[PDB]
């Protein structure tokens, strides 16, 4: 039994999905739908860049959601069976929810564009930071962040695997937390090309804006279980899912525990339905007996459809 997992920011690259689009017309057809919603040519953005434009979050997010939905559509078109479960990393959660039939595609494209804008405006450039903490246990990091906060905000924001955790918050507090993590025995505390301090308390007022927009959008029952980032729960209440997306924005992404949870339900393989191999690489680090592979190249797509 397999699940589909959907990547978020960082997995985009100029030229992504080029090979798949050349093999499957539905890819550019899907991007053409997104572009109509956005008011610009999203495919052209992904194929021509420049990178700096693709990497701006209110453009990254629709690019990624569309790429993922395109790949899902290829899978389905070529006769692939629905996965037993889905999950997605931050932005990826929206992709999962579209593929599970909860949110209309065009609605979701507009939604994640607005999500990215709300995120971008949350704090002044230069106020926030993120850092990757490598080689320290979840608990020790949370403690380092507590000690370091001193009335600013810093907390774990991505639990990506055992030994790979991102923290974020106000820049000074992230610096202090970083140092503390090193002192507690972390192998690295590496500062990231951040800006937006995602998934911490600084995103509350952005979440409050997002909630207003989510409320305007119809949510349907999922046709496949989607494990959410914030609670590691498969909500079905249209209005409960919507509600979990709000809290997602200012709470940590529980990726490690989400991958554990899928394995506990009997999932044996994760297919990464998006560009890159980021979630693929995390998988064995979380559960060493899980396997994973990506579905963003024609040949791999063919190979999975043969199974």
UniProtKB/Swiss-Prot annotation:
Q: Does the keyword Protein biosynthesis apply?
A: no
What cellular component GO annotations does this protein have?
cytosol
* Top EC category: transferase
Give the active-site positions. Answer: 90, 199
List, in alphabetical order, the Gene Ontology terms for molecular function in this entry.
Answer: [acyl-carrier-protein] S-malonyltransferase activity
Keywords, in A-Z order: Acyltransferase, Fatty acid biosynthesis, Fatty acid metabolism, Lipid biosynthesis, Lipid metabolism, Transferase
Q: In which pathway does it act?
A: Lipid metabolism; fatty acid biosynthesis
Reaction(s) catalysed (UniProt annotation): holo-[ACP] + malonyl-CoA = malonyl-[ACP] + CoA
Q: One Pfam match, by short name?
A: Acyl_transf_1
Q: What is its EC number?
A: 2.3.1.39
Output the GO biological process annotations, alphabetical, semicolon-separated. Answer: fatty acid biosynthetic process
Under the heading InterPro entries, the entry gives:
Ac_transferase_dom_sf, Acyl_transferase_dom, Acyl_Trfase/lysoPLipase, Mal-CoA-ACP_Trans/PKS_FabD, Malonyl_CoA-ACP_transAc, Malonyl_CoA-ACP_transAc_FabD, Malonyl_transacylase_ACP-bd
Answer yes or no on keyword Acyltransferase.
Answer: yes
Spell out the family assignment given in the record's similarity comment. Belongs to the FabD family.
- NCBIfam families found in the cross-reference section: fabD (TIGR00128)
* Name of protein: Malonyl CoA-acyl carrier protein transacylase
The scientific name of the source species is: Escherichia coli (strain K12)
């Amino acid at each position: 039994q397999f699940a589909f997992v959907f990547p978020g920011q960082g997995s985009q690259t100029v030229g992504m999905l080029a090979d798949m689009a050349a093999s499957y017309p539905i890819v550019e057809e899907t991007f053409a739908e997104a572009s109509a919603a956005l008011g610009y040519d999203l495919w052209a953005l992904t194929q021509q860049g420049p990178a700096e434009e693709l990497n701006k979050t209110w453009q990254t997010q629709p690019a990624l959601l569309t790429a993922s939905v395109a790949l899902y559509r290829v899978w389905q078109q070529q006769g692939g069976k629905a996965p037993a479960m889905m999950a997605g990393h931050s932005l990826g959660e929206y992709s999962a929810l579209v593929c599970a039939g909860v949110i209309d595609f065009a609605d979701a494209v507009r939604l994640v564009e607005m999500r990215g804008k709300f995120m971008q405006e949350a704090v002044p450039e230069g106020t926030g930071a993120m850092a990757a903490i490598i080689g320290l246990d979840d608990a020790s990091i949370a403690k380092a962040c507590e000690e370091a906060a001193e009335g600013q905000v810093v907390s774990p924001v991505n639990f990506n695997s055992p030994g790979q955790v991102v923290i974020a918050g106000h820049k000074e507090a992230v610096e202090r937390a970083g140092a503390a993590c090193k002192a507690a025995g972390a192998k690295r505390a590496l500062p990231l090309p951040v800006s937006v301090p995602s998934h911490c308390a600084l995103m509350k007022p952005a979440a409050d804006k997002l909630a207003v927009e989510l409320a305007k959008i119809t949510f349907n029952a999922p046709t496949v279980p989607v494990v959410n980032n914030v609670d590691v729960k498969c909500e079905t209440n249209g209005d409960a899912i919507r509600d979990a997306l709000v809290r997602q924005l200012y709470n940590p992404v529980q990726w490690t525990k989400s991958v554990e949870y899928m394995a506990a339900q009997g999932v044996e393989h994760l297919y990464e339905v998006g560009p890159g191999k980021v979630l693929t690489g995390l998988t064995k680090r979380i559960v060493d007996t899980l396997t994973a592979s990506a579905l963003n190249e024609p040949s791999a797509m063919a190979a999975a459809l043969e199974l």
